[PDB]
Design a protein around this nucleic acid. Structure first.
Lengths: 296, 220, 169, 159
RNA sequence: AAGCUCGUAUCAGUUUUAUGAGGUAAAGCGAAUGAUUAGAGGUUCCGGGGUCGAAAUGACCUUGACCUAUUCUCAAACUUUAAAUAUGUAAGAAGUCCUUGUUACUUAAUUGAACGUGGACAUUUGAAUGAAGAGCUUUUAGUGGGCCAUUUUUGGUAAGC
RNA sequence: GAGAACAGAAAUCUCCAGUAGAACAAAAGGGUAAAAGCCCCCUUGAUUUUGAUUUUCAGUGUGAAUACAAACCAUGAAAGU
RNA sequence: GGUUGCGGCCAUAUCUACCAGAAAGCACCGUUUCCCGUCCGAUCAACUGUAGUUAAGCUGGUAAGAGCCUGACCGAGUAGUGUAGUGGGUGACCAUACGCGAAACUCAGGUGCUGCAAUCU
């Protein structure tokens, strides 16, 4: 209700407007262009990219290509299906992204049909390594990261899926100086601390941190573990049992989803307001000019 | 100097205005453009005979200054100062350049020929198009006879064959004379200082009620 | 119709402008160490004046900000010196107010004549539970008109507490 | 003196646009360029790298070289009294496909489309593009449309 | 001038179809920047000058500026729009379609990119008109003071400047 | 534009509007907004080899520039530069 | 048909002022041990959807809305311009013939479409 500024018609005329995906602040196009431009000598070979966006209590992970008509998704992996594998809680922790990382990396291979090779690492000791090319065989799948708007800080949850993608049978170019525990004073790396973070060490150490110091803070959070009778000593066992469970059958069994589309569609138009017709526009302004400007 | 206007009568150059590249330009000779009863309202002066030029030429500020004095001095003494609203509708923008050769015995010292002949500004003259309206009188119907002759006495001081035409349509605002009378009582007229603000059908309804009361009620 | 929406303190900022450069800069900066409990930072000039005795980049004054539940307890201590009295004006159109006082010694702490008299100033910013939208990194929006803080709102929200008068007219 | 610089007399020529400023969209990069494709030149002032000389603007050439982030084109410059084969290497934002050529592409298959029908039924090819032939004899109607007399308007100034 | 290789191959100081590029003419400045005339509505404590008033962020005016809706006239070094003339390219057999190989490039992938292997499309083979034939090579005389006219325009008032 | 003792118009702090009306070493013109403008971490790719192309052009040099090849690097998590 | 993630075109979606959003999701939100950066966990960093929300963000509807776009025998064959004449006029400049053909104004309408994947009483 600030009419003092009174942005003129001239200002509203020559105002250049940003792109729709930028006007709403969802895409940084300075970084975007350098990530999608394929080598022109490669002709019609797509450059696949992997997105990781951390929304509230959920993680976005999918393999997506690009096209003039629009970006094309190859495979998808969501946090909501981790309870099916056995990860019922902790959907937005650092280790949760890694669990999806093994899930997303493995899932693309089945539909590709090349999962027989490039198994990644199955022991997971937290050590740095890439999925090296197999001699006398297909080259390893390469895919880049997509972060966009959350700042690159070491220990970020985005790099949890990076380890999962890297150790899940995919090749992603990445370095060690941003993982959760890489020393800043020197080039030292401690995979042992990473091995805890990969397997939920951070949450597990905070389990006993409240189990002896203060119970009311422990009680008000962690409601599910108390209700489901899960302790810290079994917390890591969940993730260890999770990893091989993902590789058992990562077929992305779709939900029964209940009902059908039309009743979902029917529930919308029955309550959503429609447009207005020109006769309705003329009718009310005639009524308004009669009721208000007609002087009773 | 003030060489005869026969040199600058004709449009012989591109427009050369007073811009940041145009410094040290002499001031315009004409000082006041609108004169008479400038505060007069719109409906008080139904008639205004214009004065239109016929050909392409440039009219200098001195010519505009001399004509305005001649026109104003006439109607003020016979019709009275509170009888007309005279306006000048041309502004001197083109700048006149001279080469400035001295008049004494030169050659050996005068200008070393016409080398670098670009000159310095001498005056400021307007640019007049074909059929472009010059002047406007805004008089009353009973005063047409005096005013028309007054513009006749002023057309002599311009260079050219400019003519006077019996104008129409309340020649202070646009839109035809019989149409203006139709909108005088219909309620599309707001009595504003000098000019009159018309009615719009595309703005918001709420604000229009305030300044335009006698359109939506019974009125007359 | 009063949901969880309400008015609450966003931050409290402190400022001590200094007339010149020298030892008194460090003397004034260290005052905020024992008041805010935190480390104050530097505020630097923008251009030279040549008549105030200051010039370009000479670190004229310090400042510090305090937030959270550890911010309001400073407020009433500052309000003691004014006898809990405010003015009709001193309230911004964006629902914020402040006040500047000298002989800060009335706020507490021993006089310590090696310290002197410092005119530390107050300014407190108020917002609502959800004004984060203007500070976010993804999908940065703007505060709604019906949700923005207003001068009438901050005065109204201030009046039901502290039983303070408004004086003047 | 006189200025004959590389980008001289370019003041309304390399302007980005009105109300279309800012970074270029991503559709210009996602198009596939192959050797031997007719293109057009429109210099983009957003990024000066790989930008053609002011002489080349709207000129049409053939793609012969495709490097990592640039495309090579050939321009038949007319200098003196002859044509010289000038080779230019330009980035992908100062170039766009010339859709004058593509119209010929479906014309090839359009003639080929009814080529099969022509031999299926018999002769009657008539696939050469005829120009705008003169109109043939047609009759007009007066029932419900009567001629309206018109006369030149008498002069009146209305000013 | 000497010619040379072949002969309607294909080329054009031209038109059309399709498709680009170009900011001059025009137009606009109740659109940006400059100007630029004259009023109407509020505003000045963070402006000054008159009545009253210790006294002002006091009651009443004005002066000089701001904001709002207007109004008269312009820009080679102003601009949203945007001509006419002129200008780039294409109108295909060095072409298209189906199967297939090589490559040390590229690709996750005999998947991509260059060219050929086998088969089909012939005289409306796929715009108009014209073609004392098309293309190619060597050598060298003279030439490097120009002027005038329609059209556009620069300097100078103007000039057989 | 709204506010803070000195502090007032130019001392330092906070909020709103703000397509940029600022700033990009030095002329003028284009270009630039999670940027080419502010500041901060690392670094000398301002490296080696000799080709090709554009402007002035005679299509010769010269100055400037353009995109690439075969090495070794700087940086960023990486695409990339 | 709604919502989210990634987009394509990219103000027929921008802006101003109001009203509405059971459904899932969006966002606020609660916590300061481990990572991390700030004076300030306010942004950024980490933890469970826990204690309430739909107030805000976002989406949707309206303005005789400001702008944008579209169309018009509306302005207007107007201005301008290619070709031509021992055409007019001293001169400026102007008509005619064969062609091309604007912009401002005025009026009327609209004021987002769409791809990939998941999901949503």
């Amino acid at each position: 209700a600030f009419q003092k500024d009174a942005k003129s018609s001239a200002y509203s005329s020559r105002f250049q407007t940003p792109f729709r995906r930028r006007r709403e602040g969802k895409t940084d196009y300075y970084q975007r262009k350098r990530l999608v431009t394929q080598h022109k000598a490669k002709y019609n070979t797509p450059k696949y990219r992997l997105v990781v966006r951390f929304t509230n209590k959920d993680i976005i992970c999918q393999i997506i290509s690009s096209t003039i008509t629009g970006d094309v998704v190859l495979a998808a992996a969501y946090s909501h299906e981790l309870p099916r594998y056995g990860i019922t809680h902790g959907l937005t922790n650092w280790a949760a992204a890694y669990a999806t990382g093994l899930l997303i990396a493995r899932r693309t291979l089945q539909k590709l049909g090349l999962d027989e090779t490039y198994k990644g690492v199955e022991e997971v000791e937290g050590e740095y390594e890439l999925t090296e090319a197999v001699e006398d065989g297909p080259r390893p799948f390469k895919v880049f990261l997509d972060i966009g708007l959350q700042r690159t800080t070491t220990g970020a949850r985005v790099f949890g899926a990076l380890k999962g993608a890297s150790d899940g049978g995919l090749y992603v170019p990445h370095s060690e100086n941003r993982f959760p525990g890489w020393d800043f004073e020197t080039e030292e790396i401690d995979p042992e601390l990473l091995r805890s973070y990969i397997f939920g060490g951070h949450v597990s150490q905070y389990m006993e941190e409240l189990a002896d110091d203060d119970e009311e803070r422990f009680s008000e959070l962690f409601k599910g573990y108390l209700a489901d009778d899960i302790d810290a000593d079994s917390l890591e066992d969940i993730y260890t049992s999770a990893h091989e469970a993902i590789r058992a059958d990562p077929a992305f069994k779709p939900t029964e989803k209940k009902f059908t589309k039309e009743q979902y569609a029917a529930e919308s138009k029955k309550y959503r307001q429609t447009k207005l017709s020109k006769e309705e526009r003329a009718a009310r302004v005639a009524a308004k000019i009669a009721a208000l400007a007609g002087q009773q | 100097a003030r060489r005869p206007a026969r040199c600058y009568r004709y449009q012989k150059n591109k427009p050369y205005p007073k811009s940041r590249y145009n410094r040290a330009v002499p001031d315009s000779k004409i000082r006041i453009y609108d004169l008479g009863k400038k505060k007069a309202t719109v409906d008080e002066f139904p008639l205004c005979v214009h004065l239109v030029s016929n050909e392409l030429e440039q009219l200098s500020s001195e010519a505009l200054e001399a004509a305005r004095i001649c026109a104003n001095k006439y109607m003020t003494t016979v019709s009275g100062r509170d009888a007309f609203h005279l306006r000048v509708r041309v502004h001197p923008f083109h700048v006149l350049r001279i080469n400035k050769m001295l008049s004494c015995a030169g050659a050996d010292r005068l200008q070393q020929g016409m080398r670098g002949a670009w000159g310095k500004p001498h005056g400021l003259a307007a640019r007049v198009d074909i059929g472009q309206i010059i002047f406007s009188v805004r008089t009353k119907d009973s005063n047409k006879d005096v005013v028309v002759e007054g513009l006749r006495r002023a057309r002599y001081k311009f260079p050219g064959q400019q003519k006077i035409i019996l104008s129409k349509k309340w020649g202070f605002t646009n839109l035809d004379r019989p149409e203006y009378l139709k909108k005088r009582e219909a309620g599309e007229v707001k009595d504003d200082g000098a000019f009159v603000k018309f009615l719009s059908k595309k703005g918001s309804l709420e604000n229009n009620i305030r300044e335009f009361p006698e359109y939506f009620a019974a009125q007359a | 119709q009063n949901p969880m929406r309400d008015l609450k303190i966003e931050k409290l900022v402190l400022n001590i402008s200094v007339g010149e450069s020298g030892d008194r800069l460090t003397r004034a900066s260290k005052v905020l160490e024992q008041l805010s409990g935190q480390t104050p930072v530097q505020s630097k000039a923008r251009y030279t004046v040549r008549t105030f005795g200051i010039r370009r980049n000479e670190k004229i004054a310090v400042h510090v900000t305090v937030r959270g539940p550890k911010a309001e307890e400073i407020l009433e201590r500052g309000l003691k010196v004014k006898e809990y009295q405010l003015r009709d004006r001193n309230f911004s159109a964006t629902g914020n107010f402040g006040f500047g006082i000298d002989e800060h010694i009335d706020l507490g702490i021993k006089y310590d004549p090696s310290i002197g008299i410092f005119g530390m100033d107050f300014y407190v910013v108020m917002n609502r539970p959800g004004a984060r939208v203007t500070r976010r990194k993804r999908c940065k929006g703007t505060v709604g008109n019906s949700h923005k803080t207003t001068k009438e709102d901050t005065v109204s929200w201030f009046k039901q507490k502290y039983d303070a008068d408004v004086l003047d007219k | 003196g006189k200025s004959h610089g590389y980008r001289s007399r370019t003041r309304y020529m390399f302007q980005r646009d009105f109300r279309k400023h800012g970074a270029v969209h991503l559709s210009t990069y996602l198009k596939v360029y192959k050797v031997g494709d007719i293109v057009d030149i429109k210099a983009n002032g957003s990024i000066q790298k790989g930008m053609p000389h002011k002489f080349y603007q709207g000129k049409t050439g053939v793609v012969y070289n495709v490097t990592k982030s640039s495309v090579g084109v050939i321009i038949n410059k007319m200098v003196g009294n002859r044509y010289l084969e000038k080779r230019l290497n330009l980035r992908v934002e100062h170039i766009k496909h010339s859709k004058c050529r593509q119209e010929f592409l479906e014309r090839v298959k359009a003639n080929a489309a009814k080529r099969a029908e022509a031999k299926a039924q018999g002769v009657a090819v008539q696939l050469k593009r005829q120009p705008a032939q003169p109109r043939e004899s047609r009759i007009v109607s007066t029932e419900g449309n009567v001629p309206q007399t018109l006369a030149p308007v008498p002069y009146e100034t209305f000013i």
